[PDB]
């Protein structure tokens, strides 16, 4: 028997209908720039896979960001690069401006457009109900674009959303875990941050799709409107599914595993137990009430569904009543 297969409900065959070179990133040959065009100014941060710096392009004096890669398999660099090139000019996608290699240490560096980004903690503190709706709509433009272009980000989370509040301007960054969607493909589940992982990853269902990004958007929305970051605070990959089960209930979970005939790691047997599906009110308090509204909760319910096939698409989400104010403006 083994697991029941799955196809995306949308954008299913988009890569099939493209030339091979579009998605066959292992064949991509990288176009190098001149490393001497960029001088590093200061360090902005350490990532899992990179060090990130402010730099100046001495050619034109433009401010630029340089992500110096820690060692990874070349095929993964080509993948990140290919996806960035494919998505360049798309709505609210970071622009890759150049690619250089240190000619001695041989370590590669991606050069990005600069976002004058507001600090993440100071932003998830000052955001009105309207700002959230605005920025969520802006993120969904990025997700609908990338999905329509055959790509799933697989690392949606607040740290990978760069907002310049002063200019009402948003960019979805860090495409280093992104992958091409191909029907029938089994993907690695060891992706995304713990708190943003979909159930499909947690139960080891590999034949997942774009809808993964819609779960992780849900997790973001919840933490923003209920002011609880993270929203699903698991202690590990197993307890993460338990945290989810304590909110969504276990009846839907076991129906989900039954539908796709998922062999469940026996360990999970114990710790899941039996849990009712909770109502969103439990997380409403006087600190957050100004951000919680019936539309917001309707919207959130339709993202956070175990069964990836039944979650909103990006395009559907953008048509939800939560965004009727933003759409008019
Ligand atoms: O690919 C990237 N990866 C990361 N990763 C980090 C990881 C931590 C959180 C956040 C800021 C630092 C530390 C760098 C993203 N940044 C990246 C890109 C980037 C592009 C433009 C830009 N403009 C202002 S900040 C910024 C960052």
CSV table of C-alpha atoms and ligand atoms in Angstrom, one decimal:
chain,number,residue,atom,x,y,z
A,1,UNK,CA,0.0,0.0,0.0
A,2,UNK,CA,2.3,2.8,1.3
A,3,UNK,CA,1.1,6.5,1.2
A,4,UNK,CA,-1.6,7.9,-1.1
A,5,UNK,CA,-0.2,10.3,-3.7
A,6,UNK,CA,-1.0,14.0,-4.0
A,7,UNK,CA,-0.8,16.8,-6.6
A,8,UNK,CA,-1.1,20.6,-6.0
A,9,UNK,CA,-4.7,21.8,-6.7
A,10,UNK,CA,-3.2,24.8,-8.6
A,11,UNK,CA,-0.2,25.5,-10.7
A,12,UNK,CA,0.2,21.8,-11.0
A,13,UNK,CA,2.0,21.4,-14.3
A,14,UNK,CA,3.6,24.8,-14.6
A,15,UNK,CA,7.2,23.5,-14.7
A,16,UNK,CA,6.4,20.7,-17.1
A,17,UNK,CA,5.3,23.3,-19.7
A,18,UNK,CA,8.6,25.2,-19.3
A,19,UNK,CA,12.0,24.5,-21.0
A,20,UNK,CA,14.1,22.0,-18.9
A,21,UNK,CA,16.7,24.7,-18.1
A,22,UNK,CA,14.2,26.6,-16.1
A,23,UNK,CA,13.9,24.0,-13.3
A,24,UNK,CA,16.9,21.7,-14.0
A,25,UNK,CA,19.1,23.9,-11.8
A,26,UNK,CA,22.0,21.3,-11.6
A,27,UNK,CA,22.8,22.4,-15.2
A,28,UNK,CA,22.8,26.1,-14.4
A,29,UNK,CA,26.2,27.8,-15.0
A,30,UNK,CA,26.7,30.8,-12.7
A,31,UNK,CA,27.5,34.2,-14.2
A,32,UNK,CA,30.1,35.8,-11.9
A,33,UNK,CA,30.6,39.5,-11.3
A,34,UNK,CA,33.7,41.3,-10.1
A,35,UNK,CA,34.2,41.0,-6.3
A,36,UNK,CA,36.2,44.3,-6.3
A,37,UNK,CA,33.0,46.3,-7.1
A,38,UNK,CA,31.8,45.7,-3.5
A,39,UNK,CA,33.4,46.8,-0.2
A,40,UNK,CA,31.8,45.5,3.0
A,41,UNK,CA,30.7,48.2,5.4
A,42,UNK,CA,29.3,46.4,8.5
A,43,UNK,CA,27.8,43.0,9.5
A,44,UNK,CA,24.1,42.8,9.8
A,45,UNK,CA,23.7,39.2,11.1
A,46,UNK,CA,24.7,35.5,11.1
A,47,UNK,CA,22.3,33.0,9.5
A,48,UNK,CA,22.2,29.2,9.5
A,49,UNK,CA,23.9,29.2,6.0
A,50,UNK,CA,25.5,32.7,5.6
A,51,UNK,CA,26.9,35.9,7.1
A,52,UNK,CA,25.1,39.1,5.9
A,53,UNK,CA,26.8,42.4,5.5
A,54,UNK,CA,25.9,45.9,4.4
A,55,UNK,CA,28.3,46.9,1.5
A,56,UNK,CA,28.7,49.6,-1.1
A,57,UNK,CA,29.0,49.2,-4.8
A,58,UNK,CA,31.9,51.4,-5.6
A,59,UNK,CA,30.8,51.5,-9.4
A,60,UNK,CA,27.7,53.6,-8.6
A,61,UNK,CA,27.8,54.2,-4.9
A,62,UNK,CA,24.6,52.2,-4.4
A,63,UNK,CA,24.0,50.6,-0.9
A,64,UNK,CA,23.8,46.8,-1.2
A,65,UNK,CA,23.6,43.7,0.9
A,66,UNK,CA,26.1,40.8,0.6
A,67,UNK,CA,25.3,37.3,1.8
A,68,UNK,CA,28.5,35.3,2.1
A,69,UNK,CA,27.7,31.6,2.0
A,70,UNK,CA,29.0,29.1,4.5
A,71,UNK,CA,30.0,25.9,2.6
A,72,UNK,CA,27.1,24.1,0.9
A,73,UNK,CA,26.8,21.6,-2.0
A,74,UNK,CA,27.1,23.6,-5.3
A,75,UNK,CA,23.7,22.2,-6.5
A,76,UNK,CA,22.1,24.0,-3.6
A,77,UNK,CA,23.8,27.3,-4.5
A,78,UNK,CA,22.7,26.9,-8.2
A,79,UNK,CA,19.2,26.2,-6.9
A,80,UNK,CA,19.0,29.3,-4.8
A,81,UNK,CA,20.5,31.4,-7.7
A,82,UNK,CA,18.2,29.9,-10.4
A,83,UNK,CA,15.1,30.5,-8.4
A,84,UNK,CA,16.2,34.1,-7.7
A,85,UNK,CA,16.8,34.7,-11.4
A,86,UNK,CA,13.4,33.1,-12.3
A,87,UNK,CA,11.6,35.4,-9.8
A,88,UNK,CA,13.5,38.6,-10.4
A,89,UNK,CA,11.0,41.6,-10.9
A,90,UNK,CA,8.2,39.6,-9.4
A,91,UNK,CA,6.1,41.4,-6.7
A,92,UNK,CA,7.7,41.8,-3.3
A,93,UNK,CA,10.5,39.4,-4.2
A,94,UNK,CA,14.1,40.3,-3.2
A,95,UNK,CA,16.2,41.3,-6.2
A,96,UNK,CA,19.5,39.4,-6.7
A,97,UNK,CA,21.8,42.0,-8.2
A,98,UNK,CA,25.0,40.1,-8.6
A,99,UNK,CA,27.1,37.0,-7.6
A,100,UNK,CA,30.8,37.1,-6.7
A,101,UNK,CA,33.4,34.7,-5.4
A,102,UNK,CA,36.4,35.6,-3.2
A,103,UNK,CA,39.2,34.8,-5.7
A,104,UNK,CA,41.4,33.3,-2.8
A,105,UNK,CA,39.0,31.7,-0.2
A,106,UNK,CA,36.7,30.6,-3.2
A,107,UNK,CA,33.6,31.3,-1.0
A,108,UNK,CA,30.6,32.7,-3.0
A,109,UNK,CA,28.5,35.7,-2.1
A,110,UNK,CA,25.1,36.8,-3.3
A,111,UNK,CA,24.5,40.5,-3.7
A,112,UNK,CA,21.0,41.9,-3.0
A,113,UNK,CA,19.1,45.1,-3.3
A,114,UNK,CA,19.1,46.9,0.1
A,115,UNK,CA,16.0,47.1,2.2
A,116,UNK,CA,16.0,49.8,4.9
A,117,UNK,CA,14.3,47.4,7.2
A,118,UNK,CA,12.5,48.2,10.5
A,119,UNK,CA,13.5,46.0,13.4
A,120,UNK,CA,11.3,42.9,13.8
A,121,UNK,CA,10.5,43.2,17.5
A,122,UNK,CA,9.8,47.0,17.2
A,123,UNK,CA,7.4,46.2,14.3
A,124,UNK,CA,5.4,43.2,15.8
A,125,UNK,CA,4.8,45.8,18.5
A,126,UNK,CA,3.6,48.9,16.6
A,127,UNK,CA,1.4,47.2,13.9
A,128,UNK,CA,-2.2,48.3,13.6
A,129,UNK,CA,-5.0,45.9,12.4
A,130,UNK,CA,-4.8,47.7,9.0
A,131,UNK,CA,-1.0,47.3,8.8
A,132,UNK,CA,-1.2,43.5,9.2
A,133,UNK,CA,-3.9,43.2,6.6
A,134,UNK,CA,-1.8,45.4,4.3
A,135,UNK,CA,1.5,43.4,4.8
A,136,UNK,CA,-0.3,40.0,4.6
A,137,UNK,CA,-1.8,41.0,1.3
A,138,UNK,CA,1.7,42.1,0.1
A,139,UNK,CA,3.2,38.7,1.2
A,140,UNK,CA,0.4,36.8,-0.6
A,141,UNK,CA,1.3,38.7,-3.9
A,142,UNK,CA,4.8,37.2,-3.5
A,143,UNK,CA,3.5,33.7,-2.7
A,144,UNK,CA,1.0,33.8,-5.6
A,145,UNK,CA,3.8,34.9,-8.0
A,146,UNK,CA,6.4,32.3,-6.9
A,147,UNK,CA,3.8,29.5,-6.9
A,148,UNK,CA,2.5,30.5,-10.3
A,149,UNK,CA,6.2,30.3,-11.3
A,150,UNK,CA,6.5,26.7,-10.0
A,151,UNK,CA,8.4,27.6,-6.8
A,152,UNK,CA,7.6,26.9,-3.2
A,153,UNK,CA,9.7,29.0,-0.6
A,154,UNK,CA,9.6,26.4,2.2
A,155,UNK,CA,10.9,28.9,4.8
A,156,UNK,CA,8.1,31.5,5.4
A,157,UNK,CA,8.6,33.2,8.8
A,158,UNK,CA,8.9,36.7,10.2
A,159,UNK,CA,12.7,36.8,9.9
A,160,UNK,CA,12.4,36.2,6.1
A,161,UNK,CA,10.0,39.1,5.6
A,162,UNK,CA,11.8,42.4,5.4
A,163,UNK,CA,9.6,45.5,5.9
A,164,UNK,CA,10.6,49.1,5.4
A,165,UNK,CA,7.6,50.6,7.3
A,166,UNK,CA,8.5,54.2,6.3
A,167,UNK,CA,7.9,53.3,2.6
A,168,UNK,CA,5.1,50.7,3.1
A,169,UNK,CA,7.4,48.3,1.3
A,170,UNK,CA,7.9,44.6,1.8
A,171,UNK,CA,10.3,41.9,0.4
A,172,UNK,CA,10.3,38.2,0.8
A,173,UNK,CA,13.9,37.1,1.3
A,174,UNK,CA,16.0,34.0,1.8
A,175,UNK,CA,15.1,31.6,-1.1
A,176,UNK,CA,17.9,29.2,0.0
A,177,UNK,CA,15.4,26.5,0.9
A,178,UNK,CA,13.0,27.1,-2.0
A,179,UNK,CA,12.4,24.3,-4.5
A,180,UNK,CA,10.6,23.7,-7.8
A,181,UNK,CA,7.3,21.9,-7.6
A,182,UNK,CA,7.0,18.8,-9.8
A,183,UNK,CA,4.0,16.5,-9.6
A,184,UNK,CA,4.8,13.1,-8.1
A,185,UNK,CA,8.0,14.4,-6.4
A,186,UNK,CA,8.9,13.5,-2.9
A,187,UNK,CA,10.7,16.2,-1.1
A,188,UNK,CA,12.8,16.5,2.0
A,189,UNK,CA,10.7,17.2,5.1
A,190,UNK,CA,13.7,18.5,7.1
A,191,UNK,CA,12.9,22.1,6.0
A,192,UNK,CA,11.5,25.3,7.6
A,193,UNK,CA,11.8,26.5,11.2
A,194,UNK,CA,10.2,24.2,13.8
A,195,UNK,CA,7.5,26.7,14.7
A,196,UNK,CA,6.5,27.2,11.1
A,197,UNK,CA,6.5,23.5,10.0
A,198,UNK,CA,3.3,22.1,8.4
A,199,UNK,CA,1.9,18.8,9.7
A,200,UNK,CA,2.9,17.1,6.4
A,201,UNK,CA,6.6,17.7,7.4
A,202,UNK,CA,5.9,16.5,10.9
A,203,UNK,CA,4.3,13.2,10.0
A,204,UNK,CA,6.8,12.7,7.1
A,205,UNK,CA,4.5,13.0,4.1
A,206,UNK,CA,7.0,13.9,1.4
A,207,UNK,CA,4.7,14.5,-1.6
A,208,UNK,CA,3.8,18.0,-0.5
A,209,UNK,CA,3.4,21.3,-2.5
A,210,UNK,CA,3.0,25.1,-2.5
A,211,UNK,CA,0.3,24.7,0.3
A,212,UNK,CA,3.1,24.2,2.8
A,213,UNK,CA,3.8,28.0,2.5
A,214,UNK,CA,0.1,28.6,3.4
A,215,UNK,CA,0.4,26.8,6.7
A,216,UNK,CA,3.5,28.8,7.6
A,217,UNK,CA,1.8,32.0,6.6
A,218,UNK,CA,-1.0,31.0,9.0
A,219,UNK,CA,1.5,30.5,11.9
A,220,UNK,CA,2.8,34.1,11.2
A,221,UNK,CA,-0.7,35.6,11.1
A,222,UNK,CA,-1.7,33.9,14.4
A,223,UNK,CA,1.3,35.2,16.3
A,224,UNK,CA,0.7,38.7,14.9
A,225,UNK,CA,-3.0,39.0,15.8
A,226,UNK,CA,-2.8,37.1,19.2
A,227,UNK,CA,0.6,38.6,20.1
A,228,UNK,CA,2.0,35.2,21.0
A,229,UNK,CA,5.4,34.5,19.2
A,230,UNK,CA,5.8,31.7,18.5
A,231,UNK,CA,2.1,30.6,18.3
A,232,UNK,CA,2.9,26.8,18.2
A,233,UNK,CA,5.8,26.5,20.7
A,234,UNK,CA,7.0,22.9,20.3
A,235,UNK,CA,10.0,21.5,22.3
A,236,UNK,CA,11.0,19.3,19.3
A,237,UNK,CA,9.6,18.0,16.0
A,238,UNK,CA,7.3,15.6,17.8
A,239,UNK,CA,6.0,18.0,20.5
A,240,UNK,CA,5.4,20.5,17.7
A,241,UNK,CA,2.7,18.3,16.2
A,242,UNK,CA,1.3,17.9,19.7
A,243,UNK,CA,1.0,21.7,20.2
A,244,UNK,CA,-0.9,21.8,16.9
A,245,UNK,CA,-3.1,18.9,18.0
A,246,UNK,CA,-4.0,20.7,21.2
A,247,UNK,CA,-5.5,23.5,19.1
A,248,UNK,CA,-6.8,21.9,15.9
A,249,UNK,CA,-7.9,18.7,17.7
A,250,UNK,CA,-6.8,15.1,17.0
A,251,UNK,CA,-10.0,13.9,15.2
A,252,UNK,CA,-9.0,15.9,12.0
A,253,UNK,CA,-5.4,14.8,12.4
A,254,UNK,CA,-6.3,11.1,12.4
A,255,UNK,CA,-8.7,11.7,9.5
A,256,UNK,CA,-5.8,13.4,7.7
A,257,UNK,CA,-3.4,10.5,8.3
A,258,UNK,CA,-6.2,8.0,7.3
A,259,UNK,CA,-6.9,9.8,4.0
A,260,UNK,CA,-3.2,9.7,2.9
A,261,UNK,CA,-2.5,6.3,4.5
A,262,UNK,CA,0.4,7.8,6.4
A,263,UNK,CA,2.5,5.3,8.4
A,264,UNK,CA,2.8,7.2,11.7
A,265,UNK,CA,6.1,7.0,13.6
A,266,UNK,CA,5.1,4.8,16.6
A,267,UNK,CA,6.6,7.2,19.1
A,268,UNK,CA,3.9,9.8,18.3
A,269,UNK,CA,1.3,7.1,19.4
A,270,UNK,CA,1.9,8.0,23.0
A,271,UNK,CA,2.3,11.7,23.2
A,272,UNK,CA,-0.6,12.8,21.0
A,273,UNK,CA,-3.5,11.6,23.1
A,274,UNK,CA,-7.0,12.9,22.4
A,275,UNK,CA,-7.7,16.6,22.1
A,276,UNK,CA,-10.7,18.7,21.2
A,277,UNK,CA,-10.6,21.3,18.5
A,278,UNK,CA,-10.4,24.6,20.3
A,279,UNK,CA,-12.1,28.0,19.5
A,280,UNK,CA,-10.0,31.1,18.7
A,281,UNK,CA,-11.4,33.0,21.7
A,282,UNK,CA,-9.1,31.3,24.1
A,283,UNK,CA,-6.2,33.3,22.6
A,284,UNK,CA,-8.2,36.6,22.7
A,285,UNK,CA,-7.4,39.0,25.6
A,286,UNK,CA,-7.5,42.8,26.1
A,287,UNK,CA,-3.9,43.3,24.9
A,288,UNK,CA,-4.7,41.9,21.4
A,289,UNK,CA,-8.4,42.4,20.9
A,290,UNK,CA,-7.9,45.5,18.6
A,291,UNK,CA,-6.2,43.1,16.1
A,292,UNK,CA,-8.7,40.2,16.3
A,293,UNK,CA,-11.8,40.4,14.2
A,294,UNK,CA,-14.3,37.8,12.9
A,295,UNK,CA,-12.9,38.1,9.4
A,296,UNK,CA,-9.3,37.6,10.7
A,297,UNK,CA,-10.4,34.4,12.5
A,298,UNK,CA,-12.3,33.1,9.4
A,299,UNK,CA,-9.2,33.8,7.3
A,300,UNK,CA,-6.9,32.1,9.8
A,301,UNK,CA,-9.1,29.0,10.1
A,302,UNK,CA,-8.9,28.4,6.4
A,303,UNK,CA,-5.1,28.5,6.4
A,304,UNK,CA,-4.4,26.3,9.4
A,305,UNK,CA,-5.8,22.9,8.1
A,306,UNK,CA,-4.0,19.6,8.5
A,307,UNK,CA,-4.9,18.5,5.0
A,308,UNK,CA,-2.8,20.6,2.7
A,309,UNK,CA,-5.3,20.0,-0.2
A,310,UNK,CA,-8.0,21.9,1.7
A,311,UNK,CA,-6.0,25.1,2.7
A,312,UNK,CA,-6.6,28.4,0.9
A,313,UNK,CA,-4.5,29.1,-2.2
A,314,UNK,CA,-2.7,32.4,-2.2
A,315,UNK,CA,-5.1,33.6,-4.9
A,316,UNK,CA,-8.2,32.5,-2.8
A,317,UNK,CA,-6.7,34.1,0.3
A,318,UNK,CA,-6.3,37.5,-1.4
A,319,UNK,CA,-10.0,37.4,-2.2
A,320,UNK,CA,-11.0,36.9,1.4
A,321,UNK,CA,-13.1,39.7,3.2
A,322,UNK,CA,-10.2,40.4,5.7
A,323,UNK,CA,-8.6,42.3,2.7
A,324,UNK,CA,-11.7,44.2,1.4
A,325,UNK,CA,-10.3,47.5,2.9
A,326,UNK,CA,-6.8,47.0,1.4
A,327,UNK,CA,-8.2,45.9,-2.0
A,328,UNK,CA,-10.3,49.1,-2.3
A,329,UNK,CA,-7.1,51.2,-1.5
B,1,LIG,O1,19.3,35.9,2.0
B,1,LIG,C1,19.3,36.5,3.1
B,1,LIG,N1,19.5,35.8,4.3
B,1,LIG,C2,19.4,36.7,5.3
B,1,LIG,N2,19.4,36.3,6.6
B,1,LIG,C3,19.3,37.2,7.8
B,1,LIG,C4,19.4,36.2,9.0
B,1,LIG,C5,19.1,37.1,10.3
B,1,LIG,C6,17.8,37.7,10.3
B,1,LIG,C7,17.7,38.7,9.1
B,1,LIG,C8,18.8,39.7,9.2
B,1,LIG,C9,20.1,39.1,9.2
B,1,LIG,C10,20.2,38.1,10.4
B,1,LIG,C11,20.4,38.3,7.9
B,1,LIG,C12,17.9,37.8,7.8
B,1,LIG,N3,19.3,38.0,4.9
B,1,LIG,C13,19.2,37.9,3.5
B,1,LIG,C14,19.0,38.9,2.6
B,1,LIG,C15,18.8,40.3,2.7
B,1,LIG,C16,18.6,41.1,1.6
B,1,LIG,C17,18.3,42.5,1.7
B,1,LIG,C18,18.3,43.1,3.0
B,1,LIG,N4,18.2,44.4,3.3
B,1,LIG,C19,18.2,44.6,4.6
B,1,LIG,S1,18.5,43.2,5.6
B,1,LIG,C20,18.5,42.3,4.1
B,1,LIG,C21,18.8,40.9,4.0
